Amino acid sequence: LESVSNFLKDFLHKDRDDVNVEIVFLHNISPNLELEALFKRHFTQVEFYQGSVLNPHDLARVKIESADACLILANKYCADPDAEDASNIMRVISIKNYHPKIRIITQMLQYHNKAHLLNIPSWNWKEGDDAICLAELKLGFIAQSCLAQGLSTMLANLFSMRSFIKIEEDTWQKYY
Amino acid sequence: KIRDHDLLDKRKTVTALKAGEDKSIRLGLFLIISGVVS
Amino acid sequence: ELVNDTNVQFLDQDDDDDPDTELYLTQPFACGTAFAVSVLDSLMSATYFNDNILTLIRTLVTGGATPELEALIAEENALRGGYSTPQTLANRDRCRVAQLALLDGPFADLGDGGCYGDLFCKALKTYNMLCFGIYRLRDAHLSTPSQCTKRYVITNPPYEFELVPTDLIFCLMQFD
Amino acid sequence: LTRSEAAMTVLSGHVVVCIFGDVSSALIGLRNLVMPLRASNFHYHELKHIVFVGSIEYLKREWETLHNFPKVSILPGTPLSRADLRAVNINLCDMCVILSANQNNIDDTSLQDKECILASLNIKSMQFDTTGVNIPIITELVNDTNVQFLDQDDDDDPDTELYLTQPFACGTAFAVSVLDSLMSATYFNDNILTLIRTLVTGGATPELEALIAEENALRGGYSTPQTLANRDRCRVAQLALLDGPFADLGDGGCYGDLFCKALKTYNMLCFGIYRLRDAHLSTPSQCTKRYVITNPPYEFELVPTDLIFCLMQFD
């Protein structure tokens, strides 16, 4: 209910085009309390499924041969970061085994483990496949701000989709 | 305090038919069965 | 940094606290003094809709780490010391982030109420700086003098935008 | 030894053993893997050098059970670090064995082999002054359904048994679960397990394991004519149809002639053939992968790229 929230608010944003592609979700354990309410709030463009991404049987029913990309999410609040992102590599292996040509977008908790994606013979970043390394960007934005303050909040505003808003007041936030 | 709150923006069409397709098929089956039973 | 972004309330004593507000509205984030990792969840969507954008962030933030260089890091882990050459020495002509003050002689003539569009043109044509944002003093809109040295970030001000001699500008200065 | 010392050393035809070990992890009893490679069958210059790669704190516990053996070496390191396996000259080895001491500290029934699988993909994706995809690998698996991830050009289906799957038929994977069948065979014939014992362990006799039961270590003997006569046993080996003794028959002759010739001339007992996966196709291909044929039926046709298993005599 938190991990999808920051994603869905920006993916289904009103200020992009009628790019109505969001129609699926897939993980073993059943949804809980207001996650089902958040799915019902977007009843037309969610279509969740129970099923495990390690079975080529489950991938076949999700029609992943037809899909444009496969977005993989990982919990930055893990008890052992070097176990999760290693586990997450074989999620990429399972997908690339079932179908080699699909785009993978993924997130990595540590930096060193990012090298492993190049070993998978059908990973080619020149076709779009990429790994968002959380420690690399997190410490990168902070490092950049030691040269000029506010550059972290500058860049973090360029990627989230955001409407223009009018404020009548002369408070600082009118210009912001 | 609570800013402008949010914005009133929504653009949906139930795709074309989903709940109406399910209900109209179900109703047709109910009328078929209750015809035979009657 | 913050692990849970709702704790942003406690970083300052003179803000307005409200748990329903998003980070991007809150004062210590708009000032660039807080940075939770959760603002990077938006980067998934941007990377799906444009592949190119993440490569720009990479070059701007990491200090220009090229696919060629991270191959050596993947193989040996450590950063292997090189012996200098003309081709190596020509490599370091990249741009750097910096911020600049409107109190220096080159721009003080324009910093008493001139419009941003003149400063942009002057700096780019003379020095190739590419001025791209302005870092304003929080209370500079008020006529009443105040001791708040706190500032906030304005991205891409719209040409006819008026600046005051206490403002700082972000730019991409050349190497020489 | 350190990477520098290993790089100064020259190794070829050696065996590299990768161990995912840890300070808390259980003993896997490496004495069992070293022992058959030290059978008195081999001449001293014929022994394969063994190098272990792993965390030294694990090796410290195993090593006091095996320091009596001729050629052994340890590189303290991690199997995932390319600089370590570049230093032990992995591209010239005869076998890379990948083992996990961990198979119980995590109970997820799915993620169980994750560290072990990644080590195989690292070695296959190396490159040298050629790519690493030709290097011999035999990795173990804790849960046999993970066999799917060892290759990119197989057909994945979770309902198939190991014995049908490509990397097991090629002899590059070996889960322990295939030994569950050995119960039935040992019930229906007592004798069969004693044959497996003598063929696999390097001839460990009930007399010898009594000394091991009493002292734990392998007690060094003083040589005698009766001791020296003991080492006339047969050894497993594989042979290529490109040598002069058999090349005359390797262009399409039938296996039955080769069997008779080799047995009558050299007492070899040829018993299986190790075929190149694509040799049936007319289209040339780069797959150096092979599969095992047991006991081919006499009038069976062979091609000059095939290798044969046999039980060569000592001399």
PDB file of C-alpha atoms in Angstrom, chain C residues 2-175:
ATOM      1  CA  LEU C   2      15.283  10.566   6.411  1.00  0.00           C
ATOM      2  CA  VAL C   3      14.145   6.905   6.386  1.00  0.00           C
ATOM      3  CA  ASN C   4      10.432   7.718   6.835  1.00  0.00           C
ATOM      4  CA  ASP C   5       9.459  10.960   5.074  1.00  0.00           C
ATOM      5  CA  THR C   6       6.615  11.957   7.501  1.00  0.00           C
ATOM      6  CA  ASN C   7       9.297  12.814  10.131  1.00  0.00           C
ATOM      7  CA  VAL C   8      10.280  15.883   8.006  1.00  0.00           C
ATOM      8  CA  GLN C   9       8.042  17.970  10.349  1.00  0.00           C
ATOM      9  CA  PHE C  10      10.613  17.977  13.181  1.00  0.00           C
ATOM     10  CA  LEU C  11      13.568  19.440  11.206  1.00  0.00           C
ATOM     11  CA  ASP C  12      12.313  23.073  11.654  1.00  0.00           C
ATOM     12  CA  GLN C  13      10.436  25.106  14.301  1.00  0.00           C
ATOM     13  CA  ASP C  14       8.852  27.820  12.068  1.00  0.00           C
ATOM     14  CA  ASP C  15       7.087  25.767   9.343  1.00  0.00           C
ATOM     15  CA  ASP C  16       3.427  24.628   9.109  1.00  0.00           C
ATOM     16  CA  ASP C  17       3.092  20.948  10.126  1.00  0.00           C
ATOM     17  CA  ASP C  18       0.463  18.823   8.337  1.00  0.00           C
ATOM     18  CA  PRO C  19       0.946  15.009   7.803  1.00  0.00           C
ATOM     19  CA  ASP C  20      -1.260  15.048   4.647  1.00  0.00           C
ATOM     20  CA  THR C  21       1.216  17.275   2.679  1.00  0.00           C
ATOM     21  CA  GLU C  22       3.704  15.803   0.160  1.00  0.00           C
ATOM     22  CA  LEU C  23       7.465  16.294   0.718  1.00  0.00           C
ATOM     23  CA  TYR C  24       7.749  18.635  -2.284  1.00  0.00           C
ATOM     24  CA  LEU C  25       5.547  21.261  -0.523  1.00  0.00           C
ATOM     25  CA  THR C  26       7.291  21.081   2.895  1.00  0.00           C
ATOM     26  CA  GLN C  27       9.714  23.867   3.803  1.00  0.00           C
ATOM     27  CA  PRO C  28      12.921  21.901   4.687  1.00  0.00           C
ATOM     28  CA  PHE C  29      12.668  19.896   1.427  1.00  0.00           C
ATOM     29  CA  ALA C  30      11.937  23.005  -0.679  1.00  0.00           C
ATOM     30  CA  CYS C  31      15.015  24.574   0.993  1.00  0.00           C
ATOM     31  CA  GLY C  32      17.154  21.485   0.154  1.00  0.00           C
ATOM     32  CA  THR C  33      18.028  20.507   3.793  1.00  0.00           C
ATOM     33  CA  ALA C  34      16.183  17.147   3.811  1.00  0.00           C
ATOM     34  CA  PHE C  35      16.284  14.259   1.313  1.00  0.00           C
ATOM     35  CA  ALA C  36      14.301  11.042   1.845  1.00  0.00           C
ATOM     36  CA  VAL C  37      14.931   8.161  -0.621  1.00  0.00           C
ATOM     37  CA  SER C  38      11.169   7.914  -1.429  1.00  0.00           C
ATOM     38  CA  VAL C  39      11.370  10.847  -3.932  1.00  0.00           C
ATOM     39  CA  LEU C  40      13.312   8.463  -6.246  1.00  0.00           C
ATOM     40  CA  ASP C  41      10.228   6.185  -6.639  1.00  0.00           C
ATOM     41  CA  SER C  42       9.018   8.636  -9.341  1.00  0.00           C
ATOM     42  CA  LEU C  43      12.146   7.826 -11.419  1.00  0.00           C
ATOM     43  CA  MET C  44      10.602   4.503 -12.573  1.00  0.00           C
ATOM     44  CA  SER C  45       7.909   6.275 -14.625  1.00  0.00           C
ATOM     45  CA  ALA C  46      10.329   8.730 -16.228  1.00  0.00           C
ATOM     46  CA  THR C  47      12.690   5.857 -17.190  1.00  0.00           C
ATOM     47  CA  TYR C  48       9.773   3.967 -18.784  1.00  0.00           C
ATOM     48  CA  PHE C  49       8.451   6.918 -20.840  1.00  0.00           C
ATOM     49  CA  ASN C  50      11.968   8.059 -21.915  1.00  0.00           C
ATOM     50  CA  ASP C  51      14.996   5.738 -21.812  1.00  0.00           C
ATOM     51  CA  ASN C  52      17.428   8.620 -22.417  1.00  0.00           C
ATOM     52  CA  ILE C  53      16.668  10.585 -19.215  1.00  0.00           C
ATOM     53  CA  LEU C  54      18.418   8.222 -16.760  1.00  0.00           C
ATOM     54  CA  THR C  55      21.668   8.416 -18.781  1.00  0.00           C
ATOM     55  CA  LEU C  56      21.636  12.219 -18.400  1.00  0.00           C
ATOM     56  CA  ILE C  57      21.083  11.991 -14.620  1.00  0.00           C
ATOM     57  CA  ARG C  58      23.933   9.484 -14.511  1.00  0.00           C
ATOM     58  CA  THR C  59      26.452  11.827 -16.255  1.00  0.00           C
ATOM     59  CA  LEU C  60      25.283  14.928 -14.341  1.00  0.00           C
ATOM     60  CA  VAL C  61      25.368  13.328 -10.863  1.00  0.00           C
ATOM     61  CA  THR C  62      28.010  10.550 -10.740  1.00  0.00           C
ATOM     62  CA  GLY C  63      30.799  12.799 -12.106  1.00  0.00           C
ATOM     63  CA  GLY C  64      30.698  11.384 -15.682  1.00  0.00           C
ATOM     64  CA  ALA C  65      31.166   7.635 -14.928  1.00  0.00           C
ATOM     65  CA  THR C  66      31.298   6.091 -18.451  1.00  0.00           C
ATOM     66  CA  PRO C  67      30.337   2.438 -19.324  1.00  0.00           C
ATOM     67  CA  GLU C  68      34.035   1.937 -20.197  1.00  0.00           C
ATOM     68  CA  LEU C  69      35.194   2.926 -16.655  1.00  0.00           C
ATOM     69  CA  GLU C  70      32.608   0.899 -14.713  1.00  0.00           C
ATOM     70  CA  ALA C  71      33.852  -2.202 -16.617  1.00  0.00           C
ATOM     71  CA  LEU C  72      37.261  -1.828 -14.842  1.00  0.00           C
ATOM     72  CA  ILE C  73      35.421  -1.343 -11.525  1.00  0.00           C
ATOM     73  CA  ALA C  74      33.303  -4.464 -12.204  1.00  0.00           C
ATOM     74  CA  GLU C  75      36.497  -6.517 -12.787  1.00  0.00           C
ATOM     75  CA  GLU C  76      38.889  -5.312 -10.017  1.00  0.00           C
ATOM     76  CA  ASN C  77      36.492  -3.526  -7.524  1.00  0.00           C
ATOM     77  CA  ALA C  78      39.097  -0.847  -6.731  1.00  0.00           C
ATOM     78  CA  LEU C  79      39.844   2.278  -8.874  1.00  0.00           C
ATOM     79  CA  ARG C  80      43.113   1.449 -10.735  1.00  0.00           C
ATOM     80  CA  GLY C  81      45.670   4.390 -10.897  1.00  0.00           C
ATOM     81  CA  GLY C  82      46.680   5.381 -14.452  1.00  0.00           C
ATOM     82  CA  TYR C  83      49.777   6.963 -16.009  1.00  0.00           C
ATOM     83  CA  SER C  84      49.065  10.350 -17.663  1.00  0.00           C
ATOM     84  CA  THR C  85      48.926  10.875 -21.496  1.00  0.00           C
ATOM     85  CA  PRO C  86      47.674  13.638 -23.898  1.00  0.00           C
ATOM     86  CA  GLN C  87      44.493  11.599 -24.616  1.00  0.00           C
ATOM     87  CA  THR C  88      43.892  11.157 -20.841  1.00  0.00           C
ATOM     88  CA  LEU C  89      44.580  14.869 -20.207  1.00  0.00           C
ATOM     89  CA  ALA C  90      42.125  15.967 -22.961  1.00  0.00           C
ATOM     90  CA  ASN C  91      39.326  13.931 -21.286  1.00  0.00           C
ATOM     91  CA  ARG C  92      38.750  16.444 -18.407  1.00  0.00           C
ATOM     92  CA  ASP C  93      37.025  19.245 -20.391  1.00  0.00           C
ATOM     93  CA  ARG C  94      33.570  18.547 -18.931  1.00  0.00           C
ATOM     94  CA  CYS C  95      31.222  21.050 -17.283  1.00  0.00           C
ATOM     95  CA  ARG C  96      30.665  21.280 -13.492  1.00  0.00           C
ATOM     96  CA  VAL C  97      27.812  22.451 -11.330  1.00  0.00           C
ATOM     97  CA  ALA C  98      28.369  25.622  -9.331  1.00  0.00           C
ATOM     98  CA  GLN C  99      26.407  28.495  -7.823  1.00  0.00           C
ATOM     99  CA  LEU C 100      27.326  32.157  -8.219  1.00  0.00           C
ATOM    100  CA  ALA C 101      26.515  35.419  -6.383  1.00  0.00           C
ATOM    101  CA  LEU C 102      25.201  38.666  -7.961  1.00  0.00           C
ATOM    102  CA  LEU C 103      27.744  40.723  -5.897  1.00  0.00           C
ATOM    103  CA  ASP C 104      30.755  40.185  -8.234  1.00  0.00           C
ATOM    104  CA  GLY C 105      31.644  42.916 -10.781  1.00  0.00           C
ATOM    105  CA  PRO C 106      30.699  40.821 -13.906  1.00  0.00           C
ATOM    106  CA  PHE C 107      26.976  40.760 -12.899  1.00  0.00           C
ATOM    107  CA  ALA C 108      26.451  43.314 -10.080  1.00  0.00           C
ATOM    108  CA  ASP C 109      25.503  45.913 -12.761  1.00  0.00           C
ATOM    109  CA  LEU C 110      22.425  43.759 -13.579  1.00  0.00           C
ATOM    110  CA  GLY C 111      21.578  42.556 -10.038  1.00  0.00           C
ATOM    111  CA  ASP C 112      19.552  45.538  -8.750  1.00  0.00           C
ATOM    112  CA  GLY C 113      16.271  44.689 -10.577  1.00  0.00           C
ATOM    113  CA  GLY C 114      17.235  43.569 -14.126  1.00  0.00           C
ATOM    114  CA  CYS C 115      15.402  40.628 -15.753  1.00  0.00           C
ATOM    115  CA  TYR C 116      16.832  37.072 -15.772  1.00  0.00           C
ATOM    116  CA  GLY C 117      16.754  36.840 -19.597  1.00  0.00           C
ATOM    117  CA  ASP C 118      19.539  39.461 -19.944  1.00  0.00           C
ATOM    118  CA  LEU C 119      21.733  37.623 -17.414  1.00  0.00           C
ATOM    119  CA  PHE C 120      21.221  34.281 -19.188  1.00  0.00           C
ATOM    120  CA  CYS C 121      22.201  35.722 -22.579  1.00  0.00           C
ATOM    121  CA  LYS C 122      25.208  37.668 -21.158  1.00  0.00           C
ATOM    122  CA  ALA C 123      26.651  34.738 -19.192  1.00  0.00           C
ATOM    123  CA  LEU C 124      26.164  32.159 -21.983  1.00  0.00           C
ATOM    124  CA  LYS C 125      27.596  34.389 -24.766  1.00  0.00           C
ATOM    125  CA  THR C 126      30.587  35.612 -22.696  1.00  0.00           C
ATOM    126  CA  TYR C 127      31.588  32.580 -20.570  1.00  0.00           C
ATOM    127  CA  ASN C 128      29.466  29.599 -21.803  1.00  0.00           C
ATOM    128  CA  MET C 129      28.010  29.186 -18.238  1.00  0.00           C
ATOM    129  CA  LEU C 130      24.361  28.123 -18.933  1.00  0.00           C
ATOM    130  CA  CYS C 131      22.614  29.706 -15.929  1.00  0.00           C
ATOM    131  CA  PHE C 132      19.529  27.475 -15.235  1.00  0.00           C
ATOM    132  CA  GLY C 133      18.004  28.223 -11.819  1.00  0.00           C
ATOM    133  CA  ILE C 134      17.904  30.845  -9.061  1.00  0.00           C
ATOM    134  CA  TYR C 135      18.216  30.264  -5.300  1.00  0.00           C
ATOM    135  CA  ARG C 136      16.218  32.883  -3.531  1.00  0.00           C
ATOM    136  CA  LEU C 137      16.307  34.215   0.024  1.00  0.00           C
ATOM    137  CA  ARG C 138      13.018  33.145   1.735  1.00  0.00           C
ATOM    138  CA  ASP C 139      12.024  36.584   2.999  1.00  0.00           C
ATOM    139  CA  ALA C 140      13.318  38.719   0.053  1.00  0.00           C
ATOM    140  CA  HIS C 141       9.754  39.407  -1.118  1.00  0.00           C
ATOM    141  CA  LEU C 142       8.927  41.105   2.212  1.00  0.00           C
ATOM    142  CA  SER C 143       9.672  44.811   2.777  1.00  0.00           C
ATOM    143  CA  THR C 144      10.335  44.061   6.506  1.00  0.00           C
ATOM    144  CA  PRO C 145      14.040  43.076   7.078  1.00  0.00           C
ATOM    145  CA  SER C 146      14.560  39.608   8.649  1.00  0.00           C
ATOM    146  CA  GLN C 147      17.379  37.292   9.833  1.00  0.00           C
ATOM    147  CA  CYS C 148      16.270  34.116   7.943  1.00  0.00           C
ATOM    148  CA  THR C 149      19.320  33.105   5.860  1.00  0.00           C
ATOM    149  CA  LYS C 150      17.146  30.180   4.586  1.00  0.00           C
ATOM    150  CA  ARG C 151      16.565  29.913   0.810  1.00  0.00           C
ATOM    151  CA  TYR C 152      14.397  28.074  -1.732  1.00  0.00           C
ATOM    152  CA  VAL C 153      14.930  26.798  -5.298  1.00  0.00           C
ATOM    153  CA  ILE C 154      13.362  28.303  -8.449  1.00  0.00           C
ATOM    154  CA  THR C 155      13.926  26.225 -11.628  1.00  0.00           C
ATOM    155  CA  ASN C 156      13.996  27.915 -15.082  1.00  0.00           C
ATOM    156  CA  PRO C 157      12.566  31.432 -14.297  1.00  0.00           C
ATOM    157  CA  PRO C 158      10.568  32.813 -17.286  1.00  0.00           C
ATOM    158  CA  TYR C 159      12.901  35.465 -18.921  1.00  0.00           C
ATOM    159  CA  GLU C 160      11.107  38.695 -17.759  1.00  0.00           C
ATOM    160  CA  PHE C 161      11.645  37.483 -14.135  1.00  0.00           C
ATOM    161  CA  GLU C 162      13.064  40.095 -11.711  1.00  0.00           C
ATOM    162  CA  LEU C 163      16.124  39.434  -9.525  1.00  0.00           C
ATOM    163  CA  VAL C 164      17.582  41.166  -6.422  1.00  0.00           C
ATOM    164  CA  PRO C 165      21.237  41.457  -5.314  1.00  0.00           C
ATOM    165  CA  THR C 166      20.894  38.798  -2.537  1.00  0.00           C
ATOM    166  CA  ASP C 167      19.990  35.955  -4.985  1.00  0.00           C
ATOM    167  CA  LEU C 168      22.345  33.112  -6.010  1.00  0.00           C
ATOM    168  CA  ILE C 169      22.230  31.442  -9.472  1.00  0.00           C
ATOM    169  CA  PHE C 170      22.913  27.810 -10.461  1.00  0.00           C
ATOM    170  CA  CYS C 171      25.096  27.286 -13.563  1.00  0.00           C
ATOM    171  CA  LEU C 172      27.191  24.712 -15.480  1.00  0.00           C
ATOM    172  CA  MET C 173      30.635  26.384 -15.620  1.00  0.00           C
ATOM    173  CA  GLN C 174      33.238  25.228 -18.158  1.00  0.00           C
ATOM    174  CA  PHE C 175      36.593  23.752 -17.153  1.00  0.00           C
TER     175      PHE C 175
END
